[PDB]
Write a protein that holds these residues in place. Sequence first.
Motif, short mmCIF file in Angstrom:
data_model
loop_
_atom_site.label_atom_id
_atom_site.label_comp_id
_atom_site.label_asym_id
_atom_site.label_seq_id
_atom_site.Cartn_x
_atom_site.Cartn_y
_atom_site.Cartn_z
N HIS A 79 -5.60 4.95 6.37
CA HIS A 79 -6.82 4.27 6.82
C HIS A 79 -6.54 3.62 8.17
N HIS A 81 -6.02 0.79 9.71
CA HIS A 81 -5.42 -0.53 9.92
C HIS A 81 -4.04 -0.31 10.53
N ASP A 83 -0.95 -1.20 9.89
CA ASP A 83 0.23 -0.80 9.14
C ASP A 83 0.28 0.70 8.89
N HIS A 148 -10.39 -0.89 -0.60
CA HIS A 148 -9.74 -1.75 0.37
C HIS A 148 -10.42 -1.66 1.73
N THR A 149 -10.77 -0.45 2.14
CA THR A 149 -11.63 -0.21 3.29
C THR A 149 -12.57 0.90 2.89
N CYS A 167 -2.93 1.19 0.72
CA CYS A 167 -3.26 -0.21 0.56
C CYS A 167 -4.36 -0.44 -0.45
ZN LIG Z 1 -5.54 -1.99 5.25
#
Ligand SMILES: [Zn+2]
Length: 228
Positions: A79, A81, A83, A148-149, A167
């Motif tokens: 995704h 983000h 990380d 999470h997203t 995540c």
């Molecule tokens: Zn994330």
Amino acid sequence: GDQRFGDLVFRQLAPNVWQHTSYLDMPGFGAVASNGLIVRDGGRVLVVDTAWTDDQTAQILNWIKQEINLPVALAVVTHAHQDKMGGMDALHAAGIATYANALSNQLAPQEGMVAAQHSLTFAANGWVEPATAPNFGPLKVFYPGPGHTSDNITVGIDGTDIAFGGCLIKDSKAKSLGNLGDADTEHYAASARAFGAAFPKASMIVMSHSAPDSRAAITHTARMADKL
Ligand SMILES: [Zn+2]
Ligand SMILES: C[C@H](CS)C(=O)N1CCC[C@H](C(=O)O)C1
Ligand SMILES: [Zn+2]
């Protein structure tokens, strides 16, 4: 065990599978670990998730060169983000083909990420449309729904007992789901259960922010998401 390589940590999980771990100081949370995967498929290597930064991601490629010494055919990121996608430019500089959910690529600029080169799309049932994930070998990519997203995806490794929740999934003893500013609170709980049902034989659940856990990670994450 945990092999330290510079500021990163590598752990072998199965004969052809390793977990990569990298750390970023997040003011307010400490030095946060993020995990991804490295898979050898015959004469090539496949990567799931970057590290937090380009420099750390280049170190992943250096570790691969030292410990496996085969070309990295592709990377898939789970995704938009930092990380999971923070090191995209390092993969591109190395000439590695990159893949993400179409929605991750759409979101990447506003999230401060560089998009992957190729976009995955998904059938109504969540499985990747096969023509968008060519030459993925044992990587089985599944969109469980928004959680999470809105763009989070998950990956199983055929020939192993391993599935990667990224995540979306937290360990058996997590207390919260974390920052939820991008989360889909209505659908999170169903998406977590959908990941478990897509990989029903996986007994080792790998995730971004905890060490690998049993399937109790999925049930616990779902049981926790039920409350909201
Ligand atoms: Zn994330
Ligand atoms: C930068 C990442 C993107 S997932 C983030 O937001 N985190 C890291 C893990 C701890 C917190 C959590 O959500 O559990 C917050
Ligand atoms: Zn994360």
